[PDB]
Design a protein around this ligand. Structure first.
Ligand SMILES: COc1cc(F)ccc1-c1c(CN(C)Cc2ccccc2)[nH]c2c(NS(C)(=O)=O)cc(C(C)C)cc12
Ligand SMILES: COc1cc(F)ccc1-c1c(CN(C)Cc2ccccc2)[nH]c2c(NS(C)(=O)=O)cc(C(C)C)cc12
Lengths: 13, 247, 220, 12
């Protein structure tokens, strides 16, 4: 959930 | 009533910083430093995965799911590798500027986890794992769990996994090994891969428990209600299928 | 080769950023304060929402006031607690976090500690009351506006004036004569104006160790 | 940064 934000940001970026 | 009596009514109670004297300054610095470094290590793992041949061909949702399941498998295995290459499994080499001596550690639960992280490293030492075996094994750890209801690109996932499984075989061969000792190495390297499920489960358990007690509860107690609510399971026994080479 | 591709994409080791030149105690104070500050901001936003007339304003203005005034409210609440608890001798950040300036070995930290004690020292010198402080703190929320202007600039102008009046009432309540009242109003409003410089230097210091606005005055 | 922290707290 908090880690999920880090992963999606780094995934889309 | 008066406008100032309203201001007095709404003045918030002072906040406690949560400074726990039971925790030494050095211990506190190490465990806050490792949390920040881990956040960056996750970011690096995502960038690395995006560049793995085949990975970006999977559905975007699958890519997200794989990274969500496997971030600590990749971190704990790379920690194992560096701890082997630098200290020959004597110390936890988290970073060049952050090496931890498991003996100069105050708590035993921390110690047991360090011995468990050192176990990955001692096994990579014991088996004298090559850079190419490591690279194939680390790639396979990104592909070690799937949802129980399957991925959107399940067939492609299976094909990619088999490709990197074949790639691990190719890497074993370059050790100039005996044919019987090659079939034996595949067994031992895949057995170490399978054992990562228990290493990570126990490590994430310890990390989350320590973090909630020593950081959240002490320095953000207000966060707790939403953390424990978000942690509720959607399915009775979860949706993670842990892949094993040996049933 | 597929394995050649893996050797190529392997990231470089990340550094922890551990600096031994920074002692463990002061590292723990800086980090704990960074976290505490984050929570005080949330508490300040929750407080503002409860101020008579604040939610009646425009949501973009409510957002821009809090974004301008968060460190104004925190440094001021810090000054008050330090004055009440230690007679402006220590920085009383929290009941369980009290900082003695002469335990801060790096000079830049010490000079910032000394500057934060100024607000406290002025509150002590002027013997500021709770009612005066509450009014002064509401005024610190309404002390910075954008050069590009606020959407509900009219309602803001009116509400700031109502809080300047509530301060006058708190001053009156000290039972000073009409001449003591006008000089006390001048002193409290000069301290209010001095917050702009206090926050700029403090915000500068904090970003320096970590890595359009029209600042209203009572006296020109 | 802090803009998001202020946004979350104000909206909620
Ligand atoms: C670079 O970091 C690591 C790399 C690695 F391959 C394995 C473990 C860690 C690691 C992290 C990192 N986070 C982000 C993990 C985490 C997970 C869940 C919840 C919070 C944090 N944090 C640690 C802490 N701090 S703690 C005690 O949980 O507050 C202690 C230890 C040892 C010294 C025991 C190890 C770690
Ligand atoms: C509860 O906290 C405070 C209350 C207060 F009314 C005034 C100042 C602080 C304060 C904060 C809090 N953040 C959130 C400020 C900030 C802003 C931007 C970027 C980073 C940090 N952090 C401090 C640090 N640590 S530092 C050196 O920046 O790494 C040191 C000192 C003193 C001991 C000098 C003070 C603070």
């Amino acid at each position: 959930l908090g880690l999920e934000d880090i992963i999606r940001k780094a995934l889309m970026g | 009533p008066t406008l100032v009596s309203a201001l007095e009514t709404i003045e918030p109670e002072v906040l406690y910083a949560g400074y726990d004297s039971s925790v030494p300054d050095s211990t506190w610095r190490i465990m806050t430093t490792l949390n920040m470094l881990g956040g960056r290590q996750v970011i690096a793992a995502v960038k690395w995965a995006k560049a793995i041949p085949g990975f970006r061909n999977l559905h975007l949702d699958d890519q997200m799911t794989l990274l969500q399941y496997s971030w600590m498998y990749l971190m704990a295995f790379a920690l194992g590798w560096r701890s082997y290459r630098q200290s020959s499994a004597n110390l936890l080499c988290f970073a060049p500027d952050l090496i931890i001596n498991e003996q100069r550690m105050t708590l035993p639960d921390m110690y047991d986890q360090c011995k468990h992280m050192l176990y990955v490293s001692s096994e990579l030492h014991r088996l004298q794992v090559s850079y190419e075996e490591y690279l194939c094994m680390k790639t396979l750890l990104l592909l070690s769990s799937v949802p129980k209801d399957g991925l959107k690109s399940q067939a492609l996932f299976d094909a990619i996994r088999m490709t990197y499984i074949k790639e691990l075989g190719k890497a074993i061969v370059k050790r100039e090994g005996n044919s019987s000792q090659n079939s034996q190495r595949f067994y031992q390297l895949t057995k170490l891969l399978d054992s990562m499920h228990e290493v990570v489960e126990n490590l994430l358990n310890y990390c989350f428990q320590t973090f909630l007690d020593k950081t959240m509860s002490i320095e953000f107690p207000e966060m707790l209600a939403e953390i424990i609510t978000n942690q509720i399971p959607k399915y009775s026994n979860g949706n993670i299928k842990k892949l094993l080479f040996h049933q």
